[PDB]
Every structure is written in C-alpha cells, then in structure tokens.
Design an enzyme around this catalytic site. Sequence first.
Site, short mmCIF file in Angstrom:
data_model
loop_
_atom_site.label_atom_id
_atom_site.label_comp_id
_atom_site.label_asym_id
_atom_site.label_seq_id
_atom_site.Cartn_x
_atom_site.Cartn_y
_atom_site.Cartn_z
N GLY A 24 0.87 -1.16 0.00
CA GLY A 24 0.00 0.00 0.00
C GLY A 24 0.91 1.21 0.00
N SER A 25 0.33 2.40 -0.06
CA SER A 25 1.10 3.63 -0.24
C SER A 25 2.17 3.83 0.84
CB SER A 25 0.17 4.84 -0.26
OG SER A 25 -0.38 5.06 1.02
N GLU A 27 3.93 1.85 2.31
CA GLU A 27 5.04 0.89 2.17
C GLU A 27 5.90 1.12 0.92
OE1 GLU A 27 1.71 -0.29 2.76
OE2 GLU A 27 2.36 0.26 4.80
N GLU A 46 -4.00 -10.07 4.37
CA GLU A 46 -2.93 -9.99 5.37
C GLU A 46 -2.89 -11.17 6.33
OE1 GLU A 46 -4.87 -7.55 4.35
OE2 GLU A 46 -3.63 -5.86 3.79
N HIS A 69 0.19 -3.04 5.51
CA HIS A 69 -0.25 -1.67 5.20
C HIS A 69 -1.08 -1.06 6.33
CE1 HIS A 69 -1.33 1.82 2.84
NE2 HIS A 69 -2.62 1.52 2.90
N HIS A 280 -8.30 -27.51 26.52
CA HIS A 280 -9.25 -26.93 25.59
C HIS A 280 -10.64 -27.10 26.19
CE1 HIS A 280 -10.74 -26.66 21.11
NE2 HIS A 280 -11.27 -25.73 21.89
N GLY A 400 -5.57 -22.04 17.98
CA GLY A 400 -6.86 -22.54 17.54
C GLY A 400 -7.56 -21.66 16.52
C1 TPP Z 1 -6.20 -4.12 3.93
C2 TPP Z 1 -5.50 -3.30 2.88
N1 TPP Z 1 -4.39 -3.78 2.21
C3 TPP Z 1 -3.75 -3.01 1.25
C4 TPP Z 1 -4.23 -1.75 0.94
C5 TPP Z 1 -3.52 -0.90 -0.09
N2 TPP Z 1 -4.19 -0.64 -1.35
C6 TPP Z 1 -4.88 0.52 -1.63
S1 TPP Z 1 -5.50 0.59 -3.11
C7 TPP Z 1 -4.90 -0.84 -3.47
C8 TPP Z 1 -5.22 -1.25 -4.88
C9 TPP Z 1 -6.43 -2.15 -5.01
O1 TPP Z 1 -6.52 -2.49 -6.38
P1 TPP Z 1 -7.92 -2.84 -7.10
O2 TPP Z 1 -8.86 -3.37 -6.06
O3 TPP Z 1 -7.69 -3.88 -8.17
O4 TPP Z 1 -8.53 -1.49 -7.70
P2 TPP Z 1 -7.64 -0.59 -8.68
O5 TPP Z 1 -6.59 0.09 -7.83
O6 TPP Z 1 -6.99 -1.48 -9.72
O7 TPP Z 1 -8.52 0.43 -9.36
C10 TPP Z 1 -4.17 -1.45 -2.44
C11 TPP Z 1 -3.50 -2.79 -2.52
C12 TPP Z 1 -5.33 -1.25 1.63
N3 TPP Z 1 -5.80 -0.03 1.37
N4 TPP Z 1 -5.97 -2.04 2.58
C1 TPP Z 2 -10.98 -17.90 13.22
C2 TPP Z 2 -11.81 -18.96 13.87
N1 TPP Z 2 -13.18 -18.99 13.69
C3 TPP Z 2 -13.93 -19.99 14.29
C4 TPP Z 2 -13.30 -20.95 15.08
C5 TPP Z 2 -14.13 -22.03 15.75
N2 TPP Z 2 -14.12 -23.34 15.12
C6 TPP Z 2 -13.44 -24.43 15.61
S1 TPP Z 2 -13.62 -25.77 14.75
C7 TPP Z 2 -14.59 -25.03 13.71
C8 TPP Z 2 -15.12 -25.90 12.61
C9 TPP Z 2 -14.24 -25.99 11.36
O1 TPP Z 2 -14.88 -26.88 10.46
P1 TPP Z 2 -14.11 -27.75 9.34
O2 TPP Z 2 -12.99 -26.90 8.80
O3 TPP Z 2 -15.05 -28.14 8.23
O4 TPP Z 2 -13.47 -29.03 10.07
P2 TPP Z 2 -14.37 -30.21 10.70
O5 TPP Z 2 -14.72 -29.79 12.10
O6 TPP Z 2 -15.62 -30.41 9.88
O7 TPP Z 2 -13.58 -31.49 10.82
C10 TPP Z 2 -14.82 -23.69 14.01
C11 TPP Z 2 -15.70 -22.79 13.19
C12 TPP Z 2 -11.92 -20.90 15.28
N3 TPP Z 2 -11.30 -21.80 16.05
N4 TPP Z 2 -11.18 -19.91 14.66
#
Ligand code: TPP
Ligand code: TPP
Lengths: 526, 526, 526
Positions: A24-25, A27, A46, A69, A280, A400
């Site tokens: 992003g800008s 960086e 990210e 960013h 757990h 987890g």
């Molecule tokens: C979470 C996050 N990561 C990175 C950026 C940096 N960023 C700003 S604009 C941009 C370009 C996105 O490109 P696109 O969605 O294809 O639209 P375009 O610029 O081509 O018109 C990026 C990577 C951001 N703003 N937020």
């Molecule tokens: C970021 C995040 N969101 C939700 C959870 C809670 N969580 C634990 S297991 C699970 C189920 C994942 O299902 P799957 O990937 O299909 O594996 P399966 O249990 O079917 O074997 C969830 C949603 C977590 N641990 N982390």
Amino acid sequence: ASVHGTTYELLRRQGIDTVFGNPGSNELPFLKDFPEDFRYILALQEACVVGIADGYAQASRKPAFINLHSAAGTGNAMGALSNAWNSHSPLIVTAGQQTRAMIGVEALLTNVDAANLPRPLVKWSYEPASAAEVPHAMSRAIHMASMAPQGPVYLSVPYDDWDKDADPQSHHLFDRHVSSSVRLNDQDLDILVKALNSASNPAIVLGPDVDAANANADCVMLAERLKAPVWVAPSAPRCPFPTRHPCFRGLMPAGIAAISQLLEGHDVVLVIGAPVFRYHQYDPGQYLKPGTRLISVTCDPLEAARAPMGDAIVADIGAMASALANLVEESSRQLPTAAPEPAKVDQDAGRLHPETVFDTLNDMAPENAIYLNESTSTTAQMWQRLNMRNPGSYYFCAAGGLGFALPAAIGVQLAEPERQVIAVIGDGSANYSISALWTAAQYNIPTIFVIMNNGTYGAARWFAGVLEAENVPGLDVPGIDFRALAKGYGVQALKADNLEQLKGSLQEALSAKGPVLIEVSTVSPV
Amino acid sequence: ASVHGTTYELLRRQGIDTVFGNPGSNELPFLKDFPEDFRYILALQEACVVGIADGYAQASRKPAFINLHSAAGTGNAMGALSNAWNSHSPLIVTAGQQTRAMIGVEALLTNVDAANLPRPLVKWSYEPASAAEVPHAMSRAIHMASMAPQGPVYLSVPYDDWDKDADPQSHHLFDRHVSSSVRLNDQDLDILVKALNSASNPAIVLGPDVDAANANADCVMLAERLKAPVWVAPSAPRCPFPTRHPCFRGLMPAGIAAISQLLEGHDVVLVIGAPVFRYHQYDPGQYLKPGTRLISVTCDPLEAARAPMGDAIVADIGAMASALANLVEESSRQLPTAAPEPAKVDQDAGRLHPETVFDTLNDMAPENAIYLNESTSTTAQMWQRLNMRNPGSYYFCAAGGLGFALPAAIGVQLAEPERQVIAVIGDGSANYSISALWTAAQYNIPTIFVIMNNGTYGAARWFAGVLEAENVPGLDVPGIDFRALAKGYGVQALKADNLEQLKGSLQEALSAKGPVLIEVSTVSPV
Amino acid sequence: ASVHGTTYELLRRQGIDTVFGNPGSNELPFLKDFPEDFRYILALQEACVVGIADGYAQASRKPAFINLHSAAGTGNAMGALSNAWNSHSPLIVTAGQQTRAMIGVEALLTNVDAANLPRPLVKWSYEPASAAEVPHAMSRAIHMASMAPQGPVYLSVPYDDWDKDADPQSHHLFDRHVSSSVRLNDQDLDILVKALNSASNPAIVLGPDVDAANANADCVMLAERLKAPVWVAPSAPRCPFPTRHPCFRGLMPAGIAAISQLLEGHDVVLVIGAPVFRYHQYDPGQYLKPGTRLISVTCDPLEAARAPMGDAIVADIGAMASALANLVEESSRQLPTAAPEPAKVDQDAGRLHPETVFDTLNDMAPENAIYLNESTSTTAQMWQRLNMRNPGSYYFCAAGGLGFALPAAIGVQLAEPERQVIAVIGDGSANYSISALWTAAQYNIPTIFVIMNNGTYGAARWFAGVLEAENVPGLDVPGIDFRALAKGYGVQALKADNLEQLKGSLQEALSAKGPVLIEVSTVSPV
Ligand SMILES: Cc1ncc(C[n+]2csc(CCOP(=O)(O)OP(=O)(O)O)c2C)c(N)n1
Ligand SMILES: Cc1ncc(C[n+]2csc(CCOP(=O)(O)OP(=O)(O)O)c2C)c(N)n1
Ligand SMILES: Cc1ncc(C[n+]2csc(CCOP(=O)(O)OP(=O)(O)O)c2C)c(N)n1
Ligand SMILES: [Mg+2]
Ligand SMILES: [Mg+2]
Ligand SMILES: [Mg+2]
Ligand SMILES: [Mg+2]
C-alpha cells in the site's frame, strides 16, 4: 546513508532475504528499488501474508519478515498473530504509517496509537520517535523476535522516514549477535539429573518448542535412556517425537482430568517445551493425582509462571534437551513396547471416512512429508494414522485460529522445497484464508491441499454435544465448490468422491510440480 | 432468569433482532436455544462477518450486533473494525471467552487480556468481573455503540456466564433510553446563524455523518437558502448530497493544498459531519487561504480537537442540520448553476474504460440504486458519473481498509431489500473478503458485484508514481478467475469483455433474483 | 518561529497563564525563557503539583496546565489523576521526554511507552511523532481537556522539540474555539419539560458537574419552580446547591438500598450532573423501587451508558439546567419546608467532637468560605452543619484518593483570592501530600488547614466494622506533630485541644494574612 539503505543492509546482514507482504502507499518508500538479493512474496490478504510467513518461519526455524499496510493491513492479520504468539513464531511484522506531517491530523491510513493495535499478541510493539532511529528500532525488532521465548514483534514506520538519513552510528547494528542459548547451572542440573535417574516410572511430555528447537533427536535419546513413555502435549501445534517410536503414546487429550489419569502411577513427569497444559475442553478434576511429581522445562517465563502444578526451569529447549540427553544414566528398565497399529475401518465404495484418508496418505505419501492439520474433527485419528519420523513434519494452528494451515502450508513448502507439504484442511477452515491459494499458483509452490468436505463445522457440532447446546445456528456450510475456488486462483483441482478417486488424485497430486487441491468427499458426523 | 435470557431480552427491548457471526465453542452457550424472533447471519470469516454487519448498521442507521470467537475471531475482524471506527459504525462486537475456571491456565482459546486486543479501534472494550454483570455490560455496550459519536464497542464474555442466574434488578436495563440528539444552545446558535446569514460567498462541506444522520435533505435546504456550493469532504465513506443538485461541486481531493485552493474566496466554510480534513496524499501548503473562516459541526470530539483550523461545535448532526436549515434566511444571491455533464470517453470494441462502466451503470441502474466503491483507481470518475439523488446511496471503506465493499454490499442489501445494491470492486480488492459471497448465496441476498479487472493494484501504481517509487514488487495480481470464484461460493457469474457484453450482463444481473457477479475487463493504467 | 515560542503563544491565546510544575532536565528547554506574562507555581512532589492545579481548575472553571518530569514525575501524579478523572477536571498534563536521539537506547528518564503510563485515567494521551507537530498536539490536549466531559489529558514531548522550527501553518491553531455547549433538541426537550410539569411528586438529584458548570443558580430556580426536594448525589466531589435552601434534603448515602428507599414515592427523579450513582459501601437492594421514573442529564457518555436504570440525556449541564429552569411551569404545590437545624452535641472542656468543630466553623467562618473535606469519618456531619450558600464552596476527593484536599485547598485559594479556603483534613489524610504546605508558604496563599487529629484512620475502622474485619493492622497513626510539619514548611501553626482554643485558633486563622495550619485534637472513635 538513508534509512532505506541502512535497514535493508541490517536485514541482509541479520539473515533476512524474503519479505512477505501486501503493499500500500505507506510501504512504497520502503519497497521501492527493491534489492535483487531480496525476494517479495505477495499474498492477497494480510491473514495469508502472516500465515505464509509463519509457516516459513516455523519450518526454517528462523525469523520471517512481513510488510503490512497501516492499521487495516495490521488488523486483518491479528487472528494470524494470535497463532504466532502461541507457537512462539519469530515474526518481524512491519507496517507502514502515514507521513509524520499528517499523523496529527489523522489523514487517511494513519495507524492511530499504532503500538497498541497488535497488543497483547506481540512481544514488542513500537513506533520510532525519528527517522534516524528506524534501523535501531528494526534491530530491536529482529532480536526481540529471535530471542527465547520467540514470538511476533511489531514495528510501525512513517513512510517519510525511509528517504531520511540513518543514524551515523547505525553500522554498529549490522553484525550484532544475541544469544539466549542457555541451560540450567551445573549444580541445579545435576540435582535434576539425579531426580530423573532416581525415578521408578518416569513419563515425558513434549511440546512444540522441542520441534522448534530441533531437539527431537535428543528427546528420543532421553526417552530411550530413561526408558520412559512419551506423550505430545495437548492442543499440539507441532510434532516433537517420531510417531512410531516404541515410547510414543500419542497426543494427550486437552482435559485436566484426562491428563492426570494418563499420568497416574508415574512418579516423575518431565515436561519439555510445552505449556502446562494447553487444555481446551473443560474437564475438571485433579491437575495431578497423588504420587506424581511434575518438572517443566520451558523457554517462556509466562508458561512457567502459570503452571498450576510442578517445578519449572526457564531455559533454551535446544540446550537443555541436549544437556539432559547426554547426562542421564541408561536405565536397565525395559523399553516401552510400541503402540499397536490402528484398526482399519470399514469403508464402502462411496464417501470417505477420515480414517481411510489418513491411511491412504500414510501409504502413498513420502516418509519425509510435512502435514498441516486444520481438519478439526479428525485430529485424533490423524495422530494415530500418520507416521511422522522426522522433525518439522506437523503443524496445527497454535491458538486454535482457523485460516492458518492453508497459507502456512505454502510458507512451509517454500521453506522446505525438497519435502512434500500435504495440508489436510476441513471445508469450514479452508474459507478463512482461501485466497492464499493464489500465492501457491503465482510462485508455483507445490503444496498439496486436501479439503475434507463434510458440509459442516464438525468440531463445532461436537462441542455443541459436549456443552449440551441445542438449537445453535450457523454450524453448517453447504454449497461450496472448492475446485472452482482452486480454479479461481489458478490452482489445479481434483475431486475424490471415493477411495478409488482418492488414490488416483494423490498419485496425480504427489507427482505435480505446481500446487494441487483435492476436494475429498468425507462422511459427515451428523 | 438466566444471563442468557436476560441478555436476549435486553437486546430485543433495545431493538436488536439480528446476530452476525462465525461460531465457535466459546459462543455455543450464547447461541444455544437461539430465540425464534432473532435472525443469525453466518459468514465464513470474521472480516466478512464484521463487514456485513457494518454495511447493515450503516444502511439501517441502527446498531448491528456481532458474535465472534475469542482472540482468533476478534483478531480476524480488526481491519474491519478500523473501517467501522472511521465510519462511526455502531457495532456491538461480542466475543466468547473460555470458562472462567480455565482463563488463568490460559487454555486454548483463552482471549488473553481481551479488552486490549481491539484497542485502539473501539470506543469501549470490556470483560465483566462476574456472570451477573453480563447484562449490565451488554447494556453499556449497546449505549456506547449508539451514542454520538457512534462506533464499534467490544465485550468479551466467559462462556460459563450464560447459564448463570441473572440479577432480578437487571430488568431496569431493558427499556433505557439514552439520547445524544443535541444541538448548540440558543444564544451561540443565533451567533452562528448570523455569521452564515452575513456571509457573501459561503461554502458547505459535507461528510459521512450527515448521511448517517439522514440529514441530507436538511443540508439541501441549508445549501439552497445560503445559495452555497457544496462539496463532499475527502476520502468520502458516504454520499451526503444529491450529486446532480445545482449546488453540488463534487468530491474534494484528499490534499491540503488542493482543498485550500478550492475554498479560496469563500469567506465562511461550513463543514458538517466530517473530519477537518481526511487528507490522504501528502500535498502540503496552506490549510486555509487568507480570508476563509471555517466552522465545523461534528459529533466527534476527537475530530473537533484535531482540526488544524477553524472553530468547531460538537453536537448531533441531525439536530444541528435541521436547526440551521430552518433558522437561516433565504439569501437573495443567485442559486449556483449545476456542474456540466462529464464528457463521453472514447471507447472501442475491446476492454472497457472505467468511465464507460459508470456511464452504463448510470443509464441502466435504478434511480434508487445503492453503490459501494472499492475500485480504488476509479473513485473520482465514479463520483463524476453516478447520479445519486437519494440518501444512503454510496459506501466506501472509511479507513481505506480493503475487504469492506464486498461484504458490506451484502449487509446493505440485507438492510435495504427494495434498493438494488451494486458493488463496484477492483480485482485486487475483491480478494480480501471473497468468502462473503457465500453469505449472499445462502441467504439469497441479491447484491450485484461488478468486478473491475485491470490486472493490477492500480491505485498502488498511481501512488508509486506520485511517491516516485520504482522497482516496487507486488503491484500486479494476474491470473484470478472471478467467475470461478463466484461459482465456488454459489453466486451466478457473468463476464463483460466489452461494452455490449456489459450492457447484456447488467440487464441480466438487474433482473436476477439471486446475487450476481459480473467480471468486467477494464483497461489497465499501465 | 520555534516550537517553544509557538506553543507558548497557543497557550496564551487559549487563556493559559499559569504552569503548575515540578521541573527536571527534560522540561528545561520548555521552561527556559519563561514568558513574563506567565506564572510558574512550584510544588515539591507531583501529587501535590497535580492536586494544586486540580483545585485551581475546579475553582476557576477553566483548564489548568501542568508540567511534570517524564515517567517518575507522571507516575507520582497518577493517584491525583484518578481524582481528576472522576471530577472531570480539565487538566493538561505535559511531561518532558528524553531527546528523540536517546529514546531508543532508553537513556535514564526515557518515558517508555509514555502514552500508556497515565491510561486509563486520561481522556487523551499522546506523544507527537515530530517536533513540528507539538503545537498541534498541544492544541488537541487543550481542546480534549476543555470539551465536555472535561477531564485530564497527557502530552509527552521530547525535549529537543522546543528549539526546533515550528510550522508557519500552526498559527491557525491559536484562536480555534471549540464549543460543546449543547442541549437536547426542541422536540425531545418539550417531552421532558412536559414530563416534569406532569410529575405529582418530583425529586431532584444534583452532582458535581452542576457546580463545575456554575449551574447552581439555575438548579435553585428549577427546584423552586418544580417545588421539588433536592439531594446531592452520593460521594459528592462538589456542592451543587445551597445547603440551607428550603428544598435541600442533603447528601445521599452511598448505598444502593439507601438511595432507592430515599427516592421511593417520587414519580419522577431528575438527576443532573451526576453519575447514577457513585455508591461506595455495598448496600444491596433495589436500584429503583417501582413507580419511579429516573431521568439523568449527564455530560459524560460513560456515565450515561453505565447507569443501572433510567433514561439519559448526554448534554452540557449549564445549557440544560438553564433550558429547564426557563421552560418548566411554576408548580402550585407548596415549596418544600427547610430541614431542621442539626442538634448541638454534648461537649466537655476536653477533646473536640467533630460536630463541635463544624458548628464552630459555621458560626465563625465567612459566608463566602470554601470548604475542602478530607476528614473521612465525619463527612455526613460536615454536610449537615455547614451552611454553604454559594457555588464552589465544597471539594472532596472525587475518586476517594487521599492527598487531594491539602494541595487542592492551595489551588482553590490561588484561584479564589477573595474567598477564604478552609481545608478540613484528617490526621491520616494530611500525610499523603504534606509537602504541598511549602507552596502555600512560598507563594503566600492564605489557605487555612484544619487538621482533625483523632490518631487513627477513622473511616477505615468504620468500614472494618461494616465488613466484620477483626485483627486488621495499620489502622492507627500515632506520633505525628502537625505543627512541626507546618513549621518545617514555613506555615504558621496553631493548635486546639479544646473548644476555647478552637474558637481562639480559628479567630487567629481567619485574620492571618498567610497560610495557617490548626491541629485540632478530636475524639477518637476507638
Ligand atoms: C487491507 C488493505 N491492504 C492493502 C491496501 C492498499 N491498497 C490501496 S488501493 C490498493 C489497490 C487495489 O486495487 P484494485 O482493487 O484492483 O482497484 P484498482 O486500484 O486497480 O482500481 C491497495 C492494494 C489497503 N488499502 N488495505
Ligand atoms: C478464526 C476462527 N473462527 C472460528 C473458530 C471455531 N471453530 C473451531 S472448529 C470449527 C469448525 C471448522 O470446520 P471444518 O474446517 O469443516 O473441520 P471439521 O470440524 O468439519 O472437521 C470452528 C468454526 C476458530 N477456532 N477460529
Ligand atoms: C491514596 C489512598 N490511600 C488510602 C485510602 C484509604 N482510606 C480512606 S479513608 C482513610 C482514613 C483516613 O483517615 P483520616 O484522614 O485521619 O480521617 P478519619 O477517617 O480519621 O476521619 C484511608 C486510609 C485512600 N482512600 N486513598
Ligand atoms: Mg468440515
Ligand atoms: Mg490491540
Ligand atoms: Mg485492480
Ligand atoms: Mg483520622
């Protein structure tokens, strides 16, 4: 010299040659004139950047550098940082901040109160007071990330800093070497050794820091000299011991009562490189049954402090495992008999039982394969049915947090090009960091992704049962076509609706030079 | 009553009937026995959960309630929280915590130091000291979210609290009304009105809080009696003014020098519902040129404090816009002439100029369409070319965090079923929250997703130009098939390789009853 | 211009002319060339520095400016900031930081992670990213402290910033006026006025923000028009109503049950400028008994959100009290009848009962006296026995932090040269900030310190009784000679072992031109 030139030199001189990022800008003044001895790995979100970086750092056993960013980018990666916190992953996370002239006005993409954003999931978090300070701040980041107990650190850098002059004395930073490779003093280590020698029925418990220290072989030697059974600590993020060794007794269940029962009758219990313990499920009871003495060795004071029982030594796992392995007398007790082979399960010609998948993987996968686990309802079977002889053969999201294994498998495969990475991931878990697939395709990293499709959040349904939760919404995830998702991100996609197709797809996946996703139709537990 | 029952009654009596979430063990005792008068919206990742809840909250102008899983779930959502922070989105973010008995041992999925995790991106962040406190804590969360300046709040709840007995006195919480609908006192308001009446060449600058307060129509009156040109403040997260109204002068560029040049000659500039100002690019110079007096009306003290110029009044935007609209005399000055229609950009029979896409949308979309923008290199053209007559017609990531528009478009469409939501999203931006597509498919939320595929992070390349940064890696995102991505999440996918295919695809998507994704081949800026 | 010159201009232009400080190396570049139109008030420890500024800010109803020395100095004042937090005292706390060049190495007197030090007891907390930003940062602190809800703010400034060139565009900061002088919109205010007009048995409860707003006069006229009895909310930091006005019913006890019992039978309870409620002792019962509607007017969203009951209006207390006093109808109900005069307690020729002290004070002190209370076991008797006709006549540690009264007495006296301040302080409480006596002496600030020597922490023994706490150590403080301490710091010292000596000592104290301490032997509760 400029902060730009000085900082890349420090990085280079400290062993960093790869930057994981989404730009992003804020960086661009860091990333411009990107040096030819550096490699930039782009991921599309990210959480994937950090996950990839994290797998790379764990597999390589070295710090990984990340460039994000501002607040938005840093924020998107904080779930991933919780995993890295729990695994002690040395991540150097850097984020671009607005120009100093506009931080006050809080222009767009100002990371307000930046140091506080990643807390409490980082070891150290900092925004330098001046451009000249940036290399020193980066030096701190690097050593803080790398010193035991390793973990993620955070540096926010105003984008106008890079063109400014570095502190003249910055060259003192380039070759700074810091060591935390320490072990218990001679007198106290002898007392510990005598304790282990006098034990009549020792047990060993091994955590992820043994595998991060590559202390696996010393733990095998310690286990064989003490003639002691060996369990992997609960909620295991790594595999610290060969899974078919005569001493290996498998993954401890993540419960207080289950673990005290498992350890009953063992007079001394030596825990190495693990929290005591990463429970757990709530399973109240005794922390230890009478007759059991626990000794913990950990590289993290936070783990030592919070143990509900036992003594602790806070030291380097590598140094201590080696010391103990070579100091303990060989016991004349009989070496544990190897655990029995898991019983083959009944499998029809239709949808696959998880047990069938792991048996097929075990038969067809190379003996130096690396497995990543985010099939959360099949974890106990995976541990029984995969033979992992080598260190660095297993990774599971340490806090987890789902969305780890997929990108992490790509970072591991990058770190270990000569070892086949096989990511076993549930259909639920695959969606958290799905866009990581694109990095695999663009950089041609030959990870195999095996999506276990049971149409549901299986483990959530299991916990629903253990907590007697009826009428819980949102536990099913129908209507996801993972082959189209793979195709969307340019990854070769195979189906495995049955055992015949599974074996065909693994054969084709194992030979492939780019990444392959196999969608396996597994039996739902509903 | 139980803490469970008391809390849902509080939510219910406070007008909350919808939970956006992604569940986990820690949330099951809250989500169990899910009341039949509540709705649950599942998203596959937490940035999507929060993005959908944010879009919903902004379109409905009412708080949205979110339920996430521990540190991992909360972490995943933090980039999304930084957007919600800048948009003043009243988001009630609840996260499940481990049972109180295992918080100390830091069992898996303990959210350690939970209240600190979402900081600095929340107004209020809390973990109750007991189960009986939970309904009070929730009461506080709701009101903190809802009081001006609105914004995201965070509550971490140990999962064993929900089954516990509720304090009978918690009933007082149910029907509490808290009002922040305040305006400047009579004496000082008259002084402000006289200043505005006395102005020879006033200007008005409107921000997102005007749209959030639905004060658009009052600002139209205010502008028509002052005979005053109207700008939208820079980095606009919303559209607070009809874009073809004669007074409307367009989106202000996000630069210090550019804005002072624009406001040059205007003796009084009345800024309403905006920060002063949300600059982006560093374009240094004068904040205001000599002769310009600036008066800001803001609902946020933090904005009022950090303005580098002008007087400020901290007050509710709706109460103040209405008061001012009604108190100001009609000026005898002539009404500003409407800006001229933008010129038609030359378009061949191949890839589409962005200007062409917006012209086509303007000619084809309904007059009450709602647009979301995450096509970051095309914003200025979008603002010049879309006629947005009504309130609630435009949304853009308030903190510049990508991954907002796709999920937020789904939230908006949910809140506004009778207004066609069209999300214009770049090929790069699409990937941050791609799995949100699934929620639109499962709940049949008929958002149109227009993916502008230019092969690149175009806006990053533009900043690279202005920052004179060369040899920057990671600015290209080739090899993504969005129709295959749509297919993977069960959304109907069309292509538009040229103008005739665009027209045909928009015709098909507008009449579609489910969500539709159109991949548009757009000309690259390189 | 320099950052130094520009910052003093801003301060000057924003009405600041006094700096309360304890100096050190990091503050010398700020304090050097100290302007001739500024005043510096030195105190010998930072709890006293902040105590004095707090008293000054509260009495003056204007922001006070403080200058402390890095982390140790800031840290010394943090107990005093807790009181300031609770009393909404507009304190601008600047602390000097190490030179930017030595922050990274953490030289001695580096305030590490400075902004986090005073949190959570500050509205805003900041260290600027550059020297040129310091004036802007100061502008933010000034306004953040002054805006409702007023409160302490913190600015950390590296000492090398002061000599640096300021931005010419910082002149726009100088005359910024920010208003938070707001009240509920016309429509909802009419609904409230109608509800107040319709109450058959209304009660009024007033808190410290009424006194801070100087809304006392408007609340007297409001009470007289509504013909309603008036309590002060518990744990009162200030006195918002004449204590011998016919409507006055006294200080509410700081317990849940005791307040609902008091409010029982009142159909509408109008709470202005107070938390709902600042309880202290645990006295569980009903928050509000059925049949009472509680309506709270508060300047603080945090107070509005955490009220266990009632509706809330977040608005300026002055604007609201004035609005209501002018809008309510005059009730035809009879005016409440004045509470009886308290009984004369039995008093022999020995040690003084507190009741005797306050009776004597009421008899002899001037009608415009200002009282500060830190005699903790006698607060109830103090509110009964002192006639306080005027605004700004009472102060008590708002967060219960002892060491407030002694220094705040000196700040109030400095702010109110023509009103005789009499600080009534227990022997235990005198010691926390005893060094503040020196400042009274040195600047010839004629505060009267009445020290209530009962030889013990009386209110701690009281609480020890309500908590059934036996065998508690550290409750007695024998062997302190307060005349010696007064002499030590150059304050004239008198004593009163009996009523005869008390009447004589007070006569002398009232006629004295400089500070005077009176040590009164009071009856011990033991
Ligand atoms: C979470 C996050 N990561 C990175 C950026 C940096 N960023 C700003 S604009 C941009 C370009 C996105 O490109 P696109 O969605 O294809 O639209 P375009 O610029 O081509 O018109 C990026 C990577 C951001 N703003 N937020
Ligand atoms: C970021 C995040 N969101 C939700 C959870 C809670 N969580 C634990 S297991 C699970 C189920 C994942 O299902 P799957 O990937 O299909 O594996 P399966 O249990 O079917 O074997 C969830 C949603 C977590 N641990 N982390
Ligand atoms: C900084 C601080 N330390 C301790 C306390 C606890 N405390 C409250 S009242 C009190 C007794 C003070 O005794 P004294 O000033 O002699 O008055 P008395 O109770 O005898 O009337 C104490 C120690 C506190 N509130 N603040
Ligand atoms: Mg599954
Ligand atoms: Mg945080
Ligand atoms: Mg693009
Ligand atoms: Mg005492």
